[PDB]
Amino acid sequence: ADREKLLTESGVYGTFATFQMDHDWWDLPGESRVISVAEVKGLVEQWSGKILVESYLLRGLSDHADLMFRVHARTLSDTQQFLSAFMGTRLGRHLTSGGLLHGVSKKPTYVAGFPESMKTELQVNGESGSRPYAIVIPIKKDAEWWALDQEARTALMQEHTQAALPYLKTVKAKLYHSTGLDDVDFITYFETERLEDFHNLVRALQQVKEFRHNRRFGHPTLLGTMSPLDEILEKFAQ
Amino acid sequence: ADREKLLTESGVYGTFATFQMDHDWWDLPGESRVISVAEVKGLVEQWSGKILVESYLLRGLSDHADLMFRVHARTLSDTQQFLSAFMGTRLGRHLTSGGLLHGVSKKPTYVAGFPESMKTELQVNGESGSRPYAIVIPIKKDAEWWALDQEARTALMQEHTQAALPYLKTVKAKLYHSTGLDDVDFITYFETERLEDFHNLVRALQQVKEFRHNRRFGHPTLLGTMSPLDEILEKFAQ
Amino acid sequence: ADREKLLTESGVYGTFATFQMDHDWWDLPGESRVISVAEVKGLVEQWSGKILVESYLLRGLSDHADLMFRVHARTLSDTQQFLSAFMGTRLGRHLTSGGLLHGVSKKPTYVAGFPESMKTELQVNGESGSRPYAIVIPIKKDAEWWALDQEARTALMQEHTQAALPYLKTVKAKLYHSTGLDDVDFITYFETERLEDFHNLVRALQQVKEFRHNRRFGHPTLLGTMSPLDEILEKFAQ
Amino acid sequence: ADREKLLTESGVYGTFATFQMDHDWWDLPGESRVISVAEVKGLVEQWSGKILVESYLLRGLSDHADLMFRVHARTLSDTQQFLSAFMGTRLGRHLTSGGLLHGVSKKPTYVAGFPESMKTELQVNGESGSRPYAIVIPIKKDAEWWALDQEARTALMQEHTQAALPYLKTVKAKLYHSTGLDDVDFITYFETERLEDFHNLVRALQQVKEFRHNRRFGHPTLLGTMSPLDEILEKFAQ
Amino acid sequence: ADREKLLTESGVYGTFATFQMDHDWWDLPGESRVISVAEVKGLVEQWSGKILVESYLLRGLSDHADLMFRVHARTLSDTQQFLSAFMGTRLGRHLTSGGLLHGVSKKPTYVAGFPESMKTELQVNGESGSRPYAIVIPIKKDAEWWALDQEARTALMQEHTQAALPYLKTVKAKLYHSTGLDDVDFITYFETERLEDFHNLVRALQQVKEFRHNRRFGHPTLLGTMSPLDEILEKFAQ
């Protein structure tokens, strides 16, 4: 059950790591490539004790990116060790590291102050399907947002949540608190089988006032398809 | 007829994919290059069932770009599969992927609220010629735009449309709704045999108020000439 | 006389194309380099029917640039074909394409509304010398500029023109209308034997109000020396 | 004891130097790599008279960076000579230099003007552990900050200090005065065993008014693990 | 004495050229590298008639840069010819050219309008030492600055000069007028034996009003050590 503990509980660090495959990877024979896929596969299993790693095919959906990992760990030391080991494998040595972002999952700041009916809706179980699309949008808030007192922010966030409620059924959302660990305040992560819903979700949110306090939004916006690592890697060994 | 259903109907995803050819492609003999063009040509025909692909020569018109595809598909899964297959062909292995943008085609938001005579003019058949120039300008709206109510935006869009009406006859326009799928809100796409008209069209639009709510406009602005894939690729195999 | 028709008449497209030579070019023997200069020389002659090409030594004057062409053509199709052919020559295959900008030459928008004495001074023949320095500054206007009515813009332009009049004799100026063909509204081009004069010219213009409506100015500012192609290329074949 | 004099005394220059390992490093045999690690190790020891160098593993924590040095020296001349020597070693020749920033340590400008109890708290010994995480955030103040008089700035800094006091015990902080030696005003450096606390510390500080006078903040924000040089380099010679 | 005429007189153009050494330079044997240093050394002496060149070790002090020349010439033609010949030497062919900026030295615009005591202090001889640190900060003024009349700017500059007077003794300053020749208005250049003083100088200047009319400041800020060309190049041939 500890797999779920990393995915839901607070205190857990989440890292998003992007990679792009070099040209000269394909100058390697398909034999050696398949051997290299085995190494990576094996390294991940070795770390299955200390961290949970999920993989996404970004190739053909996000610019300048083929692969993303989402890594859950209780210390970033562990995530560092893993990612460094990964980048050291034969396969990793032909990758170019793109972006890298960290944030901790936390007990919610505002939700207690929302009405009880809104709390009930937030508990009712949302999207949960196999091989969803996944989106990742990093966000930095403006100075104005921190200047507001708690009551003001709580009210703006209630408005946010209200706009989003109709999309709970078809879009799963997870929030990571990132300030100080890199150049952004939050990493937002989403899963959905229907991208048009996620698009409508973001359009709904562009109406709420809070959404203009986002000094940075995307850059990049990462789009991909969530899949087992073997499947993604096996595609590269052809 | 399903080819036109992808080009006109709502719900269809449109992807714009840019590529640049490596120096070392030309270090390959003209024989192997012509072989490689056959592979790509064949791959596209294999996907002719599930997607429609159109090609544009950007070399010599847009900076740092040789080729662009506009890809229509009902799911971005299919577009992903295609693009990844493409990038894997021998030809694709010597390409560097530039930008990548997605947006869904939608039933119009404001046009119902326009006067009847304007609706008639929008129906009257515009530009439709062979081997036109094509332009692509990605756009992100400012926060102020979303703060406006529906009535205010409808009025601003009627003004936009009015400015553009005289150009219907010589410029074809298509709009893709992109928010959430990448870093922009819209992808605008245009065809014309006379670039002067398109330039005059944009100047006319720079007068309307709405046009200042474009927090981002171009970067890149892509200019090319639309042509059959064999013609473009054949040029690279010389 | 048609050479002058391309340089002065309206409707003519002007393209500015920058290039930088790769390190590995020099790894080629001086024999092959001279052969390659012949090929380029020959290609230009073959296009002398449909376009006019002029060349500028940017090496040592503009950062990250060795060569610039200014190409006049009546369609960008023809400019595309040429530049693509050029980039295909053995010499072109060792070049890295820098920036690329287009604009059409047009009948003047404001000059009719100026006083008659100012019209006469604008007619009086300015600088025209061999092997001048050449400068190219791209410009994008701010939203405020388009919000102004014609009367306001004509008055601001009369002020611009007034500031510039004393420099007509030692600086030649040409303006290209670029909006919609790339990320800028204008391409400005100048020739002078005395760079201090051009520097004073720009200083004089930084006083006029209109000059603060330039949301983008330069980036890059291109400086070079105008010369026959054979002389530039010959220098690289040593 | 002079090691501590460099780390705490005023007048001492501090340099932060980032590096990333090239792909072709791994194309060298493990033999030669181990040789190369010996050379660097030896160079550092030769400079142990004139400078103190500390090392941080950025690989897997900061994007596009594997290694950082923090170098203390009494002249930047010495730091120059060392870094240039380092970049010349065989290992250094397969590195790509990322960012580089300098600042001098100074006697505090505002702390004398704080209340006595706050001064006592600042003296009380904070975090001091082995192999901490390290963070580095470069900062540039806005024009408004310098326009304030000394009294206004003292008051805003007292507020900053207050917000940060609870974190003294679990976060060590060091400030370098950087204006004029590069494009920023300050380099901030931190050590902590608990990244959660650092994150909370930055959140607490986002409430104070002074924190909005930071025209630039991060870009990059550097995150790593502090460790002996032999251990980091050893990792690369596998 | 004409060496000093280029360094002090008006009308003289000054060019700042930055370079970085390729990895593959060190793949050349130490024999060939020392031969290459001879070539460059000789080329400089051949141009000793027409231009004065001074060299600076940027490696280890400025990011992404190893070498800088400051070149004084009466025409930029001569600077262009030199730099191009330089970049063509075997040594220059393994260099990557970084930034490049030009500006003319001019008779002062405001100093006549200052009080007489301030004029006397400006005459009293400042810093002049061997092998100083050198700093170069490019500056672009904001639109507001040019909107001001001459009296306003003279007053703002007197305030600048007053803030700076105490540093005349330990910092030498030189100003180049750059508008129109590249993307900035001024190139500022400084020599000092004590970097702490220069830092304090810039801090003192950050309090004057004029200093917030700098729309761009640095990017880059170049820091190095001034030395004979032999010594710098010799270091690279080891």
Ligand code: HEM
């Ligand atoms: C799927 C529907 C969504 C729901 C139900 C939802 C709900 C919430 C809730 C309840 C919070 C408050 C967390 C707390 O109390 O600590 C929150 C925060 C946040 N949400 Fe969403 N959200 C949704 C979609 C989105 C989207 C699409 C984005 C942006 C792409 C987004 C961006 C954020 C950000 C940046 C915060 C943190 C703001 C802050 O605490 O200062 N959310 N969301």
Ligand code: HEM
């Ligand atoms: C060729 C003639 C043109 C016509 C007839 C036209 C017409 C329209 C119409 C009717 C809409 C509203 C669609 C809806 O109801 O959702 C629209 C939207 C839009 N148009 Fe155009 N347009 C033209 C050219 C352009 C050009 C040149 C651009 C920009 C390069 C442009 C940019 C946009 C954008 C960004 C929107 C989305 C507005 C929004 O919903 O915020 N149009 N256009």
Ligand code: HEM
């Ligand atoms: C020889 C000195 C110059 C003269 C005589 C001159 C004259 C003019 C005139 C008459 C126009 C308006 C043309 C029309 O009515 O369509 C114009 C437009 C323009 N000029 Fe100049 N100019 C000079 C130098 C410059 C310089 C140095 C720059 C900037 C580097 C510049 C930037 C522009 C721009 C961007 C426009 C287009 C403005 C608009 O139409 O919205 N000019 N110039």
Ligand code: HEM
């Ligand atoms: C417990 C941790 C911290 C403490 C105890 C602390 C305390 C202080 C104190 C006392 C000063 C004044 C130095 C003087 O008077 O000359 C100062 C300056 C400064 N601190 Fe902190 N701070 C802490 C954390 C941070 C953090 C997390 C940041 C930013 C990420 C930061 C940014 C700065 C900056 C930029 C200055 C210079 C302000 C100026 O002189 O304009 N500090 N800090």
Ligand code: HEM
């Ligand atoms: C020894 C210290 C300095 C002294 C004595 C000094 C003095 C002066 C003087 C007298 C002028 C006006 C000359 C004229 O009439 O054109 C001037 C201009 C200027 N100085 Fe300084 N300066 C010093 C340091 C600096 C520094 C550190 C910077 C920036 C890093 C700087 C930036 C400028 C700029 C951009 C101008 C041109 C202002 C304009 O004409 O718009 N100066 N300086």
